[PDB]
């Protein structure tokens, strides 16, 4: 996808404020809480019986950190998301067989998490810029299905 300079500005400015040790875990956790079927892919993560257990689960936090790292890598290569996500696409599609709709869902949860954290700062135009980004990452991660 192609972001305009204003959208790239909106995205980059906000991202520099993100706590990269926490936001990933918050997004992954909520994905598992809000869309329970996604828990199917994390049988080894332990206690996921309640929202509190999921959010405080050390493995969820650690894994979310890895997911966020990937979004950061994409934010750094917005004009080549496909190349950036090629390896993760093989993993999520060819090996894990995660339905691509869940890539869209995680991106949207991330958007909800950013809105929660930044409040009024996460304006409608800023959200729009971020939707282009998560749509881009989701499409890149799903390339192997195409």
């Amino acid at each position: 996808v192609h972001l305009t300079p204003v959208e790239k500005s909106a995205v980059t400015a906000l991202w520099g404020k993100v706590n990269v040790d926490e936001v990933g875990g918050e997004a992954l956790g909520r994905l598992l809480v809000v869309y329970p079927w996604t828990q199917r892919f994390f049988e080894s993560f332990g206690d996921l019986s309640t929202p509190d257990a999921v959010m405080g689960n050390p493995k969820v936090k650690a894994h979310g950190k890895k997911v966020l790292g990937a979004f950061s890598d994409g934010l750094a290569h917005l004009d080549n998301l496909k190349g950036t996500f090629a390896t993760l696409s093989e993993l999520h599609c060819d090996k894990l067989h995660v339905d691509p709709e869940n890539f869209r869902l995680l991106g949207n949860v991330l958007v909800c998490v950013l809105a929660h954290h930044f409040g009024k700062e996460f304006t409608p135009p800023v959200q729009a810029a971020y939707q282009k980004v998560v749509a881009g990452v989701a499409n890149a991660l799903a390339h192997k299905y195409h």
Partner: protein, 141 residues
């Protein structure tokens, strides 16, 4: 189907939103139009610019329909029947679009409810909006 805990969570978010519900409905629409441009096709006769009195008025209508659904949560099919007819029969609103607005409504609540928007309440709100959407697309003939 909404659980007792979901109904409680939704009612509580509703209460916290309070009198801002109308303004928040407008904000959610604005976020939807900017984020998902395809949705604008349904409002050709609306000025969709920021500050538009039309978007403001419509946001209040959307908000009122949602509060009617939460106030009659045990029988939304009945409460939202007329709106279901309008969106499906007259407007021909693509079902995918309900997911887009529901997401923008969640984003709006999240940007306005620091304490309320916990993962559990987030899940309850998502279920509620999904329930509302199910009713509004149930009239496809």
């Amino acid at each position: 189907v909404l659980s007792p805990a979901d109904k409680t969570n939704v009612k509580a978010a509703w209460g916290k939103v309070g009198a801002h519900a109308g303004e928040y409905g407008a904000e959610a629409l604005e976020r939807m139009f900017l984020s998902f441009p395809t949705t604008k096709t349904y409002f050709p006769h609306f000025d969709l610019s920021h500050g538009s009195a039309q978007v403001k008025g419509h946001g209040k209508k959307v908000a009122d329909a949602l509060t009617n659904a939460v106030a009659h949560v045990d029988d939304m099919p009945n409460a939202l029947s007329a709106l279901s007819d309008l969106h499906a029969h007259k407007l021909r609103v693509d079902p995918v679009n309900f997911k887009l607005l529901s997401h923008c409504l969640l984003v709006t609540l999240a940007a306005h409810l620091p304490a309320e928007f916990t993962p559990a309440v987030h899940a309850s709100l998502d279920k509620f909006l999904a329930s509302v959407s199910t009713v509004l697309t149930s009239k496809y003939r």
